Amino acid sequence: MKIAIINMGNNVINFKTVPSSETIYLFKVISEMGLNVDIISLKNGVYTKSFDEVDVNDYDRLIVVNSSINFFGGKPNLAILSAQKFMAKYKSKIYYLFTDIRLPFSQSWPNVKNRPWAYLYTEEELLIKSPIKVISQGINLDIAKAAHKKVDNVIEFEYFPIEQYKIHMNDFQLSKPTKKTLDVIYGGSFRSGQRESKMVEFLFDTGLNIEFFGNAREKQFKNPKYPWTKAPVFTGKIPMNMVSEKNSQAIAALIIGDKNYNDNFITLRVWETMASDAVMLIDEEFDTKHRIINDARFYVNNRAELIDRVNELKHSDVLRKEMLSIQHDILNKTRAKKAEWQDAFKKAIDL
Ligand SMILES: O=c1ccn([C@@H]2O[C@H](COP(=O)(O)OP(=O)(O)O)[C@@H](O)[C@H]2O)c(=O)[nH]1
């Protein structure tokens, strides 16, 4: 049982970028599942085998991590064309991992077909005809299914909490009590504007000491419908394997989702915060049924409620330690089901 795993639009090498870290993380959790896995990427590396040194049909399973089909500057994107050429030539079913609601499986030939350098490829070489199995990180397959309106070869949809890989990795540990230097923290990118209201709502004009580390830049927050005067401190991106440690320098850390993730997806970020020394403060809208933790102190409705909750946390160390303790405990109850998650994942990839 040889499994192949690939990022459909991103080069994989180390943990300096999120799309490469997510792929490497997955390869690990699968390998620790007792499975035999190889990551296939642009060039050979510490975790990767090169696409043109491997014949995709040697694997009994091709798992593909989501990606856009965006050709920056309109110019060829080797990550995309190499991966699609790779997938197009596999004869069996493809397990597409849907971790981001913004990256449905999509066919590149349509794009390419119309670019000026089209002649450099052929339909035969890039059109994926194999049947696809979408594995949804979100519990709502109508949102998953809706997202893949335009693609026809996608005959199967299944739910699987893919992002729990982080809490299931064998090297996992909860963050230790760290010296506080921030009130509230949040890491990520701008999401192409997909979450501007929530980010401004909760991180701008709060009066608190807040940082937003990631690929998000202040200049991107320019939508008139969502005005602000005081933006948080935007630092740069840090490796995916440092996140909890970063998160841990803040009293609290923020959970906000895209409108479609609400009561739908549980995101990687949720575990990254729950395993950290920063108290988890979730937007009430993101999980209205409090499935993440059943205590209303972990949920906030607006900027004002968030500011109030941090004030209480800054005031009562007892309440702060108590809540981290609760979230840490609650995190482990899920980790206690590591086996059932391994089994479910296997079943999901037809094993
Ligand atoms: O400097 C940073 C900021 C974010 N992340 C990763 O990016 C993820 C969040 O990605 P996104 O902005 O798409 O947010 P989401 O939609 O997942 O909440 C986090 O969970 C981290 O794993 C990271 O590795 N380094």
Swiss-Prot record:
Catalysed reaction equations from the record: Transfers a beta-D-glucosyl residue from UDP-alpha-D-glucose to a hydroxymethylcytosine residue in DNA
GO molecular function, one term: DNA beta-glucosyltransferase activity
Keyword Glycosyltransferase attributed: yes
Top-rank taxon: Viruses
Record carries keyword Glycosyltransferase: yes
Pathway: Genetic information processing; DNA modification
Keyword annotations of the record: Glycosyltransferase, Host-virus interaction, Inhibition of host innate immune response by virus, Restriction-modification system evasion by virus, Transferase, Viral immunoevasion
Catalytic activity, EC: 2.4.1.27
Single Gene Ontology BP annotation: DNA modification
InterPro entries in the record: Phage_Bgt
Ranges in coiled-coil conformation: none
Subunit architecture: Monomer.
Main function: Catalyzes the transfer of glucose from uridine diphosphoglucose to 5-hydroxymethyl cytosine of T4 DNA to yield glucosyl 5-hydroxymethyl cytosine (glc-HMC). This DNA process seems to occur immediately after DNA synthesis since the DNA alpha-glucosyltransferase interacts with the clamp protein gp45. The glc-HMC modification protects the phage genome against its own nucleases and the host restriction endonuclease system. The glc-HMC modification also protects against the host CRISPR-Cas9 defense system.
Protein name per UniProt: DNA beta-glucosyltransferase
